[PDB]
């Protein structure tokens, strides 16, 4: 017997400035929705559009593929929740892809001990960028950070790696085991999640 409560578009993110996805949550204290319709328009146009892809971002999401996504242009969007008894519209959300960039974590983190001659030995860390990020044209710029800690230490040590995909760490405690992670952010935007940990035993001979 109740129409839906007021839905809310609570997050949008772009992993690579080429596509983005937005997510909404149903309102509580209304009836159950049997449909949602997300519509929007863009700054400097009057045309109204509907969400082009309700499937790819999973539940309660709108995914905007490349032909629907551009930078430096505000999207003004709204989701309506409907059932047999009526309907409810979210507040309008003003979103610009330029400011919601958050990459996926880096890939293939690998770590190695290296012991050369008459030169300090080091821990050698390597990784790869997330896939589908266009770095080689300069469309996208990625920065990285590593953290590492042995078990039970109260603090992480953090090392800024700038744009490199490899890094050398010198001052490790001989015989200690380290958890190592890497994350990345655009030049302008949010940090990714930390990648899964890789583990490395630093040898006694150090």
């Amino acid at each position: 017997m109740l129409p839906p409560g007021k839905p809310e578009i609570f997050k949008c993110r772009s992993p690579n400035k080429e596509t983005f996805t937005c997510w909404w949550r149903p309102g509580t204290d209304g009836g159950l929705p049997t449909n949602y319709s997300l519509t929007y328009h863009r700054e400097g146009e009057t045309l109204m559009h509907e969400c082009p892809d309700y499937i790819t971002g999973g539940p309660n999401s709108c995914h905007f593929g490349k032909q629907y996504t551009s930078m430096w242009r505000t999207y003004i969007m709204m989701v309506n929740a409907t059932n047999q008894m009526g309907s409810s519209f979210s507040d309008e959300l003003y979103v610009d892809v330029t400011y919601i960039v958050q990459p996926d974590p880096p890939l293939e983190l690998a770590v190695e001990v290296k012991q050369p001659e008459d030169r300090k030995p080091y821990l050698w860390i390597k990784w790869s960028p997330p896939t589908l990020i266009d770095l080689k044209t300069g469309w996208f710029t990625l920065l990285y950070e590593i953290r590492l800690k042995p078990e039970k230490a109260a603090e992480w040590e953090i090392h800024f790696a700038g744009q490199q995909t490899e890094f050398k760490i010198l001052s490790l405690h001989p015989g200690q085991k380290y958890l190592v992670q890497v994350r990345c952010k655009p030049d302008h935007g949010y940090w990714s999640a930390w990648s899964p940990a890789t583990f490395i035993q630093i040898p006694s001979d150090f």
Partner: protein
């Protein structure tokens, strides 16, 4: 020495966008956090009428000489509003100090960036048209309004627009550096 110029150009542009981004945040937190200023910011930028690439494909379709000339037009067009933003804010009795600071630095750095860009164009396209056509900003009376809601809105729009165009310029300079120096193998 293209490689040094490009590197310095990109340092300046990335820095200018960071400052513009922080300026706009403080301005917004401080003066307009609670109202529909965002809704009034729609379609208000003086560089809007320029034909600018809006995604990577459009960027790739634009050839380098037009692309460089585009960056220069955008930057040249911001010299007037940055000059007036600094003049207006500085002449207030109770000017927000973190905000004024950033505006002064963006004003001076924008001149430096435009100097590097002129050197880059001279080095890479020595016999270009010496053509200046850029979009005119003419929003000074709005910044000067006595009506405070109208005034804060005109400022909001100016800082929103600066935050956008600085980001765009920084991103286009990064693309061109990769294109021109590294043949798109950055």
């Amino acid at each position: 020495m293209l490689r040094d110029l490009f590197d310095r150009a990109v340092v300046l542009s990335h820095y200018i966008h960071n400052l513009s981004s922080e300026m706009f945040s403080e301005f917004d937190k401080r003066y307009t956090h609670g109202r529909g200023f965002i809704t009034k910011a729609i379609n208000s930028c003086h560089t809007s009428s320029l034909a600018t690439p809006e995604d990577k494909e459009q960027a790739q379709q634009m050839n380098q000489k037009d692309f460089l000339s585009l960056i220069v037009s955008i930057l040249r067009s911001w010299n007037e509003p940055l000059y007036h933003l600094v003049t207006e804010v500085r002449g207030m009795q109770e000017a927000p100090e973190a905000i004024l600071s950033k505006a002064v630095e963006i004003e001076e750095q924008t001149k430096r960036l435009l100097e590097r860009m002129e050197l880059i164009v001279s080095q890479v396209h020595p016999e270009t048209k010496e053509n200046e056509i850029y979009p005119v900003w003419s929003g000074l009376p709005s910044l000067q309004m006595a009506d405070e809601e109208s005034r804060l809105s005109a400022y909001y729009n100016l800082l929103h627009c600066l935050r956008r165009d600085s980001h765009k310029i920084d991103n286009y300079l990064k693309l061109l550096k990769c294109r021109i120096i590294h043949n798109n193998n950055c």
